[PDB]
Swiss-Prot record, chain A:
GO terms for molecular function: ATP binding; ATP hydrolysis activity; proteasome-activating activity; RNA binding. This is 26S proteasome regulatory subunit 4. Component of the 26S proteasome, a multiprotein complex involved in the ATP-dependent degradation of ubiquitinated proteins. This complex plays a key role in the maintenance of protein homeostasis by removing misfolded or damaged proteins, which could impair cellular functions, and by removing proteins whose functions are no longer required. Therefore, the proteasome participates in numerous cellular processes, including cell cycle progression, apoptosis, or DNA damage repair. It is linked to Birk-Aharoni syndrome: An autosomal recessive disorder characterized by failure to thrive, severe developmental delay, intellectual disability, spastic tetraplegia with central hypotonia, chorea, hearing loss, micropenis and undescended testes, as well as mild elevation of liver enzymes. Belongs to the AAA ATPase family. The gene is PSMC1. ATP binds at residues 202-209. One of its GO terms (cellular component) is proteasome regulatory particle, base subcomplex. It comes from Homo sapiens. Keywords: Acetylation, ATP-binding, Cytoplasm, Deafness, Intellectual disability, Isopeptide bond, Lipoprotein, Membrane, Myristate, Nucleotide-binding, Nucleus, Phosphoprotein, Proteasome, Ubl conjugation. Residues 62-79 have a biased composition (Basic and acidic residues). There is a cross-link at residue 213 (Glycyl lysine isopeptide (Lys-Gly) (interchain with G-Cter in ubiquitin)). The keyword Protein biosynthesis does not apply. The chain holds residues 25 to 245 of 440 of the full protein. Residues 60-80 are annotated as: Disordered.
From Swiss-Prot, chain B:
Directly interacts with NEDD8 and PSMD4/S5a, a member of the regulatory subunit of the 26S proteasome. Isoform 1 binds to NEDD8 more efficiently than isoform 2. Interacts with AIPL1. The interaction with UBD via UBA domains facilitates the linking of UBD-conjugated target protein to the proteasome complex and accelerates UBD degradation and that of its conjugates. It is found in: Nucleus. The gene is NUB1. Specific down-regulator of the NEDD8 conjugation system. Recruits NEDD8, UBD, and their conjugates to the proteasome for degradation. Isoform 1 promotes the degradation of NEDD8 more efficiently than isoform 2. Widely expressed with lowest expression in the pancreas for isoform 1 and in leukocytes, liver, prostate and skeletal muscle for isoform 2. This is NEDD8 ultimate buster 1. Induction: By TNF, IFNG/IFN-gamma and IFNB1/IFN-beta. It comes from Homo sapiens. The chain holds residues 79 to 169 of 615 of the full protein. Signal peptide: none annotated.
Curated annotation (Swiss-Prot), chain C:
The keyword Iron does not apply. The modification N6-acetyllysine is found at residue 410. It holds the Pfam family PC_rep. The modification Phosphotyrosine is found at residue 64. GO terms for molecular function: enzyme regulator activity. Component of the 19S proteasome regulatory particle complex. The 26S proteasome consists of a 20S core particle (CP) and two 19S regulatory subunits (RP). The regulatory particle is made of a lid composed of 9 subunits, a base containing 6 ATPases and few additional components including PSMD2. Interacts with RPGRIP1L. Interacts with CRY1 in a KDM8-dependent manner. It comes from Homo sapiens. This is 26S proteasome non-ATPase regulatory subunit 2. Belongs to the proteasome subunit S2 family. Keywords: Acetylation, Phosphoprotein, Proteasome, Repeat. The gene is PSMD2. One of its GO terms (biological process) is proteasome-mediated ubiquitin-dependent protein catabolic process. GO terms for cellular component: cytosol; extracellular exosome; extracellular region; ficolin-1-rich granule lumen; membrane; nucleoplasm; nucleus; proteasome accessory complex. Found in skeletal muscle, liver, heart, brain, kidney, pancreas, lung and placenta. The modification Phosphoserine is found at residue 17.
Curated annotation (Swiss-Prot), chain D:
The modification N6-acetyllysine is found at residue 75. Component of the 26S proteasome, a multiprotein complex involved in the ATP-dependent degradation of ubiquitinated proteins. This complex plays a key role in the maintenance of protein homeostasis by removing misfolded or damaged proteins, which could impair cellular functions, and by removing proteins whose functions are no longer required. Therefore, the proteasome participates in numerous cellular processes, including cell cycle progression, apoptosis, or DNA damage repair. Belongs to the AAA ATPase family. The chain holds residues 348 to 433 of 433 of the full protein. It is found in: Cytoplasm. This is 26S proteasome regulatory subunit 7. It comes from the Eukaryota. Component of the 19S proteasome regulatory particle complex. The 26S proteasome consists of a 20S core particle (CP) and two 19S regulatory subunits (RP). The regulatory particle is made of a lid composed of 9 subunits, a base containing 6 ATPases including PSMC2 and few additional components. Interacts with NDC80/HEC; this interaction is detected only during M phase. Interacts and SQSTM1. Interacts with PAAF1. Directly interacts with TRIM5. (Microbial infection) Interacts with HIV-1 Tat. The gene is PSMC2. Monoubiquitinated by RNF181. Induction: Expression is not cell cycle-dependent and occurs throughout the cell cycle.
Length: 221, 91, 745, 86, 222
């Protein structure tokens, strides 16, 4: 016997998260409403017509078993119900992994084709079949209670206009947390990454937290 | 003119000479004499050179006119490693 | 202006006051200008007596638009009415760059005959404004040899002419100058790329990567937890050390290594020796001569093919390669020919030279010429006369095809005959119906294969959405192999046509996904090659992740083809991430000799030229297409439709067709005397700057380097300082820098 | 001094600096300074120019950067205490 | 602006097309971790769900009568139970050793496949999988330091042949020390970018753990 050799490089999930997926339409330039933008948009439209006609033809003569609604309906049959939530312990192979149920028992199961293999990392929550415990999905972890606490959901009502006398202090903080995001071109043309960190120090009540409240008010991050 | 042809030859970059160099010789001579004199005219060893004439390898036995040479023809010197008999005798 | 305004808004302005148009407002004329084009289409031939005031407005609308930087709107007015002829008279010094850049971006989406018309009109602006180097680029895109002559000789600045000769040499277009032209000698040397070897070696010494690399350093088996193996490492050794002249395995005493291979393994191994000596015609031929006298048949013809590699990409004033290969095209032994025609093709690919073709032509019709050499003959003569529509090569390719019997047309070496025909009409477009007429006589299913190959090659690099409409119609009907042989080229066709510009290209990836999903095995066996063609030497993550998923495919051919495409996509990019995948793929496919051979092949291509060589057919900011490169690209990829029998079989020498596409990713700044001149440059991802006025940055996420640097796919180059004025706006290949008089004022 | 000059060139490689930036002088103005400070000096030097709406950083900006980083921020410097530990 | 009306017509038709394309193509949703339908080999999955049976992870404890032809294996099935089982017919007797993890069935618990040793997922993530964007050319003033660092941690792996021939045992450890900002981690990041072997990054604060014996345990599994 020989150990199985994975074809995927590494054991971590793909770094990219929350992309446009199949809707990653190209950045047609320029945004101005002119002919070549119309010409560029037409080419995108044309290939879609080609794509639409081709896909329809294949599914038209595809077997009744092999249909978009049938295969998805089948997928539930392979998954079954209920879908046990486990924990990924190790990725032995491309289609094989060790998972542990909530009872602490580990099983060497097979990862089915329809599972998103790029979302699989050890410690992640996986969906397992109730009977055969095979990996049949990855549960998107809900926002942790610790995540909610740090995140400021609503921007504070304190703005820079509500800060008096800290003209230089306001200016310095903008170039490190506001200007790089609003106007990144200034830094790129200069060839310098923005100032990495910033610390606000002074006597109590001088406006250190207030400037951060102003920063949080006018930030897209 | 007068039985002498303008033969422009090419030299390899290892011998840092003027690559646009001119060799003048008769046409009644054969490739054996031609190969020897090119080595002398640009300071080369005759044993390790191949010559390209009229888009075809310089056959040593046959004389120049019956080879197919002409006026204002182009030539090249090909540096050789191991002699033609030595390479055959090598293995 | 407020309501629809059909034949009204223009009418009152036309009949009413005929004062200066801008006096009524910029928004009014913008509405007025649009309606000018609207009724122009409505107006018929009999309504020529209605356009008298119509021409007057455009003679004033255009100056108004360029006055307030609304220039892209102006070009739009003449485009719709098909009167872009009068734009050049009113072009000013402050806005010449914006109109040409806008119009040139439009030629990739407008169809014929407005392709050339917009190209010539953009060419006229450059010629009038004395911007010759960019005018030559437009002429090359038009493939107008007469214009290339006229553009070249019109310039009296020899410094510009010297830099111009580089672009012709980079494209592989040769120009026969007259001795009366000043500086005739250096001009022919520059375009012939005779100094390319020394210039390429100059960077290697500068970039301290001259040291040879053994395939073991690429395999890295010490980190891993046969005849085919030896043949694989022969390609890896050649690919990694390509065009370098030095190697620790063949430049040394290679007889032990050369004889380690067996059968046709020694054919490619001997030929791999010339790939280290690529572009080194003088010193490279000095090393092959030892193996030229070998008694074993494979070594000599393998060396005979190594002749064609050593002159590939270089034009010698008198050719050495023809001398070494003329007397072996009709040799009794088939192998000796096999190294002759294929070598002869690579040495003069993109030449259209009659002497070689006449010497190469009767080989195809030879009775003793097997189908293997007959297809090789088609590949070669197609490569010499690529994109030339030479009727002489065309006549025989048909003549050989229909003379052959129906049974031997089943052989996959007959697939190279339409490719030679297709290459001969590469990119011409509407010049194949007469040829397509002759192809109906040929029997099926080869006629289905033959017409698809030439039709695809006719529209290569055109982006014609109409042409790719029929190819998917071929892809729509799936056959329950023998009948669907032509299906593979149809998938490969989408890549060959959409490759012209970015927008058309990445639509193809979406379609390529469905073909890999809904397609039949033979249909999906060609999708990886289309990925390799669409993005050669451009290692994007979307394709590489796509190719990775089907690397371990159930269908063996898709498995081999995907692995080769992965290395082909990152050919010469030295991608650290991609090499890790191949190393992981080597472990997974270690027990599969067929799969592992592609894995080793991809590692060599990934480290082609030690990261200093590219196979991309597009240079000059990815706008100008090299006919030679696609010919080698098409030769390998079409041959990969039968990877089991051609690549994995006895004809793996066809991988040497990639030599015709091997060029350096170069940015070398030369002085006016052509000596190296290292200066600070900025290298970063290219940015589209159509539209937005003012001065937009053409590079993002850039870094500052000295000039002798390698530019992979998609990165532009701008001079960091203003001390030197480049001759060409395109900072690619060899560029001549002129000292700026304004600098140090 | 040779090392600090080298670090200055590494971090000021992609800067749009003037022609005559005396990096040897800048290395001499920060005798005992870490490479991180030199990076901040380069970053702050471009910050004085970006503040002034200038696309090219002059030598004066680097001079002001050294004063702001090496001198003004010397109160928070970790070097004086950590050379005793090393 | 004369094409503003025509832009939105083709933009809306395009947006309708992607929505239409996604209808037949599928790939809608992903919250249950579903791969795009182009990768669905449902024919193989149905066979996989039947032909390939699930295997419980167990640890071999003791081999009884290994010399004879009836070797009995005592296994520890995690939290389930302990069983005395025999090997399957498709696994060699020499491939299972005491103390190693094995895969056992749910019917007779016979060992079916040897398994990799259990490793903490936190320790697994401590290995570097994306190399940093720092090279040795980005470190200035550390010439002599860099050669000493490379010749211990980079050269022996790259060119091991020059050490075995002379009977050389290269040093297997380097300590980088200096004041903050001097380039200790920067040089280490350069090492990871250039190295081709496996690189594991450990932060000393990551080895501090709540329970007694964890930090030693994580070092052991590291
Ligand atoms: N310069 C200022 N201009 C306007 N309001 C100010 C200013 N400084 C302080 N304030 C007011 O003081 C309030 C409380 O001070 P703040 O929370 O900002 O203190 P701090 O400087 O962060 O100090 P610490 O956290 O040490 O107590 C703020 O909500 C703000 O309204
Ligand atoms: N020799 C150097 N050459 C170039 N840049 C340097 C050098 N030393 C430090 N830097 C810069 O300073 C930064 C300081 O981070 P670095 O990881 O090098 O610090 P360190 O020595 O590990 O410090 P600490 O002791 O706080 O962990 C680096 O990211 C780098 O940009
Ligand atoms: Mg506070
Ligand atoms: Mg550190």
């Amino acid at each position: 016997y020989e150990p199985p050799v994975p074809t995927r490089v590494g054991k971590k999930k793909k770094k990219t998260k929350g992309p446009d997926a199949a809707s990653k339409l190209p950045l047609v330039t320029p945004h101005t409403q002119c002919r070549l933008k119309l010409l560029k948009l037409e080419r995108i439209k044309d290939y879609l017509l080609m794509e639409e006609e081709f896909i329809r033809n294949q599914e038209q003569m595809k077997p009744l078993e092999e249909k978009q609604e049938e295969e998805r309906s089948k997928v539930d049959d392979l998954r079954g119900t209920p879908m046990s939530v486990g924990t990924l312990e190790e990725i032995i192979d491309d289609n094989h992994a060790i998972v542990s149920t909530s009872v602490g028992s580990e099983h060497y199961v097979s990862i089915l084709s329809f599972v998103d293999k790029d979302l699989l990392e050890p410690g992640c929550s996986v969906l397992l079949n109730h009977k055969v415990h095979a990996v049949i999905g990855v549960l998107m972890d809900d926002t942790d209670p610790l995540v909610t606490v740090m995140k400021v959901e609503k921007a504070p009502q304190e703005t820079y206009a509500d800060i008096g006398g800290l003209d230089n202090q306001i200016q310095e903080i903008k170039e490190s947390v506001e200007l790089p995001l609003t106007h990144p071109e200034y830094y790129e043309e200069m060839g310098i990454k923005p100032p990495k960190g910033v610390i606000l120090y002074g006597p109590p009540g001088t406006g250190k937290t207030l400037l951060a409240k102003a920063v949080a008010n006018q930030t897209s991050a | 003119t007068t039985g002498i042809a303008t033969i422009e030859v090419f030299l390899p970059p290892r011998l840092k000479k003027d690559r646009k160099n001119l060799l003048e010789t008769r046409l009644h001579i054969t490739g054996r004499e031609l190969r020897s004199k090119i080595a002398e005219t640009f300071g080369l060893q005759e044993n390790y050179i191949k010559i390209v004439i009229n888009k075809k390898q310089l056959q040593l036995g046959k004389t120049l006119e019956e080879q197919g040479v002409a006026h204002n023809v182009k030539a090249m010197v090909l540096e050789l490693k191991q002699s033609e008999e030595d390479a055959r005798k090598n293995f | 202006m407020t309501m629809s305004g059909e034949r009204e808004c223009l009418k009152y302005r036309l009949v009413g006051s005929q004062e200066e148009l801008a006096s009524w407002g910029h928004e009014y004329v913008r509405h007025l200008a649009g309606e000018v084009a609207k009724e122009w289409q409505e107006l018929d031939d009999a309504e020529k007596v209605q356009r008298e005031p119509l021409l007057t407005l455009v003679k004033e609308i255009v100056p108004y638009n360029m006055a307030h930087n609304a220039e892209h709107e102006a070009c739009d007015l003449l485009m719709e009415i098909e009167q872009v002829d009068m734009l050049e008279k009113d072009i000013d010094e402050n806005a010449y760059a914006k109109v040409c850049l806008y119009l040139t971006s439009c030629v990739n989406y407008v169809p014929e005959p407005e392709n050339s018309a917009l190209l010539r009109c953009a060419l006229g602006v450059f010629r009038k404004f004395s911007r010759f180097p960019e005018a030559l680029r437009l002429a090359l895109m038009l493939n107008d040899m007469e214009l290339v002559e006229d553009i070249f000789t019109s310039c009296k600045d020899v410094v510009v002419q010297k830099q111009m000769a580089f672009m012709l040499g980079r494209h592989g277009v040769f120009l026969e100058l007259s001795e009366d032209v000043e500086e005739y000698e250096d001009l022919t040397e520059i375009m012939s790329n005779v100094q390319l070897n020394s210039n390429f070696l100059a960077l290697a010494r500068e970039l301290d990567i001259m040291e040879p690399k053994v395939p073991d350093d690429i395999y890295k088996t010490h980190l891993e937890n046969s005849a085919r193996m030896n043949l694989a490492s022969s390609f890896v050794n050649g690919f990694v050390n390509a065009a370098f002249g030095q190697d620790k395995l063949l430049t040394d005493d290679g007889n032990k290594w050369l004889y380690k291979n067996k059968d046709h393994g020694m054919l490619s191994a001997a030929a791999s020796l010339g790939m280290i000596l690529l572009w080194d015609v003088d010193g490279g031929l000095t090393q092959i001569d030892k193996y030229l006298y070998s008694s074993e048949d494979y070594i000599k013809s393998g060396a005979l093919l190594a002749c064609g590699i050593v002159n590939s990409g270089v034009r010698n004033e008198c050719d050495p390669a023809l001398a070494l290969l003329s007397d072996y095209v009709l040799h009794n032994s088939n192998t000796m020919r096999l190294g002759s025609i294929f070598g002869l093709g690579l040495a003069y690919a993109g030449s259209n030279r009659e002497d070689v073709l006449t010497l190469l032509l009767p080989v195809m019709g030879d009775s003793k010429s097997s189908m293997e050499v007959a297809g090789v003959t088609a590949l070669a003569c197609g490569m010499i006369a690529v994109g030339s529509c030479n009727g002489d090569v065309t006549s025989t390719i048909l003549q050989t095809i229909m003379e052959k019997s129906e049974t031997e047309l089943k052989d996959t070496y007959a697939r190279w005959l339409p490719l030679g025909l297709g290459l001969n009409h590469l990119g011409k477009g509407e010049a194949i119906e007469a040829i397509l007429a002759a192809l109906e006589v040929v029997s099926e299913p080869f006629r289905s294969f033959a017409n698809t190959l030439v039709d695809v090659c006719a529209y290569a690099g055109s982006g014609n959405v109409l042409k790719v409409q029929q190819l998917l119609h071929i892809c729509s009907e799936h056959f329950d192999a023998d009948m669907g042989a032509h299906q593979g080229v149809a998938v490969l066709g989408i890549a060959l046509i959409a490759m012209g510009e970015e927008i058309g290209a990445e639509m193809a990836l979406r379609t390529f996904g469905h073909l890999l999903r809904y397609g039949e095995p033979t249909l999906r066996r060609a999708v990886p090659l289309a990925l390799a063609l669409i993005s050669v030497s451009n290692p994007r993550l979307n394709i590489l992740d796509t190719l990775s998923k089907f690397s371990h495919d159930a269908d063996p051919e898709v498995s081999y083809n995907s692995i080769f495409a992965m290395g082909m996509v990152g050919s010469g990019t030295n991608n650290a991430r991609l090499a890790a995948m191949l190393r992981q793929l080597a472990q997974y496919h270690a027990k599969d000799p067929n799969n592992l051979f592609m894995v080793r092949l991809a590692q060599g291509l990934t480290h082609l030229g030690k990261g200093t060589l590219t196979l991309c057919p597009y240079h000059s900011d990815r706008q100008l297409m090299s006919q030679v490169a696609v010919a080698g690209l098409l030769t390998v990829l079409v041959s990969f439709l039968d990877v089991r029998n051609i690549i994995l079989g006895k004809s793996h020498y066809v991988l040497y067709g990639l030599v015709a596409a091997m060029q350096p990713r170069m940015l070398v700044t030369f002085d006016e005397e052509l000596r190296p001149l290292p200066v600070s440059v900025r290298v970063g991802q290219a940015v589209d700057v159509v539209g937005q006025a003012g001065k937009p940055k053409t590079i993002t996420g850039f870094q500052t380097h000295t000039t002798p640097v390698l530019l992979a796919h998609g990165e532009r180059a701008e001079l960091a300082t203003e001390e030197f004025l480049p001759v060409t706006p395109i900072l690619e290949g060899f560029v001549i820098l002129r000292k700026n008089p304004n600098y140090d004022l | 001094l040779e090392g600090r000059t080298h670090i200055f060139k590494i971090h000021a490689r992609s800067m749009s600096v003037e022609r005559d930036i005396r990096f040897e002088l800048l290395a001499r103005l920060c005798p005992n300074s870490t490479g991180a400070e030199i990076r901040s000096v380069c970053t702050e030097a471009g910050m004085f120019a970006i503040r002034a709406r200038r696309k090219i950083a002059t030598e004066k900006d680097f001079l002001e950067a050294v004063n702001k980083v090496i001198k003004s921020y010397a109160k928070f410097s970790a070097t004086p205490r950590y050379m005793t530990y090393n | 602006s004369t094409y503003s009306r025509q832009i939105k017509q083709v933009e809306d038709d395009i947006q309708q097309l992607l929505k239409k394309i996604n209808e037949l193509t599928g790939i809608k949703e992903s919250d249950t971790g579903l791969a795009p339908p182009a990768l669905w080999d449902l024919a193989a999955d149905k066979q996989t769900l039947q032909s390939e049976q699930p295997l419980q992870v167990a640890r071999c404890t003791k081999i009884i009568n290994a010399d004879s032809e009836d070797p009995k294996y005592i296994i520890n099935v995690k939290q389930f139970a302990k069983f005395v089982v025999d090997l399957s017919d498709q696994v060699a007797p020499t491939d299972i050793e005491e103390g190693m993890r094995v895969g056992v069935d749910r019917n007779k618990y016979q060992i079916h496949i040897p398994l990799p040793p259990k490793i903490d997922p936190t320790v697994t993530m401590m290995q570097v999988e994306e190399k940093p964007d720092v090279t040795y050319s980005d470190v200035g003033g550390c010439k002599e330091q860099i050669e000493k660092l490379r010749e211990v941690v980079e050269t022996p792996l790259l060119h091991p042949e020059r050490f075995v021939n002379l009977g050389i045992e290269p040093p297997k450890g380097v300590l980088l020390f200096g004041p903050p900002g001097t380039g200790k981690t920067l040089c280490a990041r350069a090492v990871a970018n250039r190295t081709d072997a496996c690189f594991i990054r450990v932060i000393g604060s990551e080895l501090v753990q709540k329970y007694v014996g964890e930090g030693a345990r994580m070092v052991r599994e590291l």
